[PDB]
Ligand binder design. Structure first.
Ligand code: HEM
Length: 152
């Protein structure tokens, strides 16, 4: 449950991401994969990436980063009214990709890390609070769908 002012902060922060969705998406995934190498194993199409240099050079990783952040941005712009947008992602990530909710926590924190890394001094405490709450809401609603599906 975010206030109007918190959603305003979220969407203000998101404008930073939308200016360079592929660069943000790439860095989010690289942060996820390098911080939590087990997550790489969930991607048949990225498990060949042995080094961060290879990850950085991967155009397909940037492409997927764009897909991920485009989806997330579409969800965030719903300001919590995202059941229709979230449902297929929860279902695909539980049933097809088999992504534990822990990895969604990892990527949520990776987003925060990337925002500070790319916008140092420009991702204020209020913005971090609002973005964190929005990612918690996202993760929590996914978690509810995971529970429905019995997925761990
Ligand atoms: C912000 C959180 C995430 C968003 C918005 C997101 C979004 C997406 C989207 C839109 C797709 C393609 C459509 C689909 O298959 O449903 C996808 C595919 C996929 N996602 Fe995610 N995802 C997120 C987090 C994760 C995490 C944390 C993992 C694993 C650690 C993961 C693993 C995968 C895999 C393996 C695929 C299939 C990739 C392929 O083979 O093309 N996702 N994701």
């Amino acid at each position: 449950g975010l206030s109007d002012g918190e959603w305003q902060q979220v969407l203000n922060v998101w404008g930073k991401v939308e200016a360079d969705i592929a660069g943000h998406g790439q860095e989010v995934l690289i942060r996820l994969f390098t911080g939590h190498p087990e997550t790489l194993e969930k991607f048949d199409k990225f498990k060949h990436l042995k080094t961060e240099a290879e990850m950085k050079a991967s155009e397909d990783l940037k492409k997927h980063g764009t897909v991920v952040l485009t989806a997330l941005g579409g969800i965030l712009k719903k300001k919590g009214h995202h059941e229709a947008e979230l449902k297929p992602l929860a279902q695909s990530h539980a049933t097809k990709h088999k992504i534990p909710i822990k990895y969604l926590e990892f990527i949520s924190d990776a987003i925060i890390h990337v925002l500070h890394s790319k916008h140092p001094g420009d991702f204020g405490a209020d913005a971090q609070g609002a973005m964190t709450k929005a990612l918690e809401l996202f993760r929590n609603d996914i978690a509810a769908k995971y529970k429905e599906l019995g997925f761990q």
